[PDB]
Amino acid sequence: IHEGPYPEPLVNLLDVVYYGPISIGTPPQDFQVIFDTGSANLWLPSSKCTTKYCLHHHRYDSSKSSTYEADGRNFTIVYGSGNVEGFISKDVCRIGSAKVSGQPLGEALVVGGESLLEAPFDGILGLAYPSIAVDGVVPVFDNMMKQGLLGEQNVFSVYLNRDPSSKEGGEVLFGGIDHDHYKGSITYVPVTAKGYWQFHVDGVKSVSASKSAPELLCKDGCEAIANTGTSLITGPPEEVDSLNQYLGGTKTEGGQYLLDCDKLESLPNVTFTISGKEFSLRSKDYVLKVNQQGQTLCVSGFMGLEMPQPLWILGDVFLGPYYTIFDRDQDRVGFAEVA
């Protein structure tokens, strides 16, 4: 869930964000969090919070934890329609069998309205670089590195299962790259700005069967991020307007576009070129069929989002067909075809 204010989108995809278990404190209190490469903060609902969001979620209670350490600096984070405010504490953070001691976390005293209200997760565990963390927070993965919990392979790898008939939603592997989730070879791209997992893209294109010219975007190259906490692909409004027009999409009304559910059958691939290799998304990958106000809507996986500097956010739509390696040893991002 990207930080910053922005328009309310038509469809709320919080239901389809990918999340997983962690525990905090001694003895462990359990939570579910988004593992979010688009942010660097860790936060959970506080037991001191009495907002509607907090009361419907699991809440961290410092007074039951023997490893809790006070801090109390205040923080704020904005997430479009919602914001999170509270204070920092420290405690043991358990991710699978790893034990991160002295991990800072935001105890959220207030959480944002209705946008975040339907979250099936309790909070967010950010996996980006420390430059985008709120003051007083060292990101979890940085602490894993500092404490030597990764056996000197300071990467993590992300596999997303989109098959809504499966049990598995995928995994995050800390300190490993699992070749049993990919085929072929990995294409690495260097990180261009250490904040987000941000890198250069060479071009974006689509070739329709029923159009006489291709759609060529990002023709001089562009910047992108790999963001596990965003469902859709977002890009500069004018480029995405153009792409969705090419595809036969109709805008309304949060930078999202709707496609005619009866005309999906010949939609073309949309191809991102990265480190000179083509990453081609199939319409079966990028069209989201959503039920909303008792309607059946075919939502384009590409939405417009105005950034301070223009940027493509390669969210779960992009990441699904790929196994992705986030490598802090070499400040690079790796992509391979998912197995």
Rounded Cα distance, 166 and 170, in Å: 10
Residue 55 contacts by C-beta under 8 Å, 6 or more apart in sequence? none
Asked, colleague to colleague, whether 1-177 and 178-338 share their fold, the answer is: yes
CA distances from 20 to 23, 41, 134, 180, 314 (A): 10, 16, 22, 20, 20
Number of neighbours of residue 202 by Cβ within 10 angstroms = 17
Q: How far apart, in Å, are the Cα atoms of 10 and each of 285, 290, 311? A: 20, 11, 21
Burial class (CB in 10 A: 0-12, 13-18, 19+), 146: exposed
Domain at 178-338: CATH architecture: Beta Barrel (2.40)
Spatial distance between the Cα atoms of 243 and 57, rounded to a whole number of angstroms: 39
- Annotated domain spans of the chain: 1-177, 178-338
| Residues 246, 211: Cα–Cα separation, whole Å | 8
Q: How far is CA 83 from CA 7, 78, 293, in A?
A: 14, 4, 25
How far apart (Å, rounded) are the C-alpha atoms in residues 154 and 330? 9
* Alpha helices per DSSP H over 94-226: 140-146
Is 43 within 8 Å of 133 (Cβ atoms)?
Answer: no
Q: How far apart are CA 140 and CA 146, in angstroms?
A: 10
Distance separating alpha carbons of residues 273 and 304, to the nearest angstrom: 19
**277-281 and 270-274: which strand pairing?**
antiparallel
The whole-angstrom separation of Cα 172 and Cα 228 is: 10
Q: d(Cα 65, Cα 69) in Å, to the nearest integer?
A: 9
Other Cβ atoms closer than 10 A to 117: 17
| Three-class DSSP category at 144 | helix
- Determine what percent of the chain falls in helix, strand and coil, rounding each to the nearest 5: 10, 45, 45
Report the Cα 1 to chain-centroid distance in Å: 6
Instruction: Kindly state the DSSP code that residue 132 receives in the 8-state scheme.
Output: G
Q: Which fold has domain 1-177?
A: Cathepsin D, subunit A; domain 1 (2.40.70)
Which residue reads 């067909």 in tokens?
321
Copy the structure tokens of residue 279: 């990453």
Residues sharing a CB contact under 8 Å with residue 290, sequence separation 6 or more, in sequence order: 11, 13, 296, 297, 298, 299
H or E segment and range at residue 72: strand 69-79
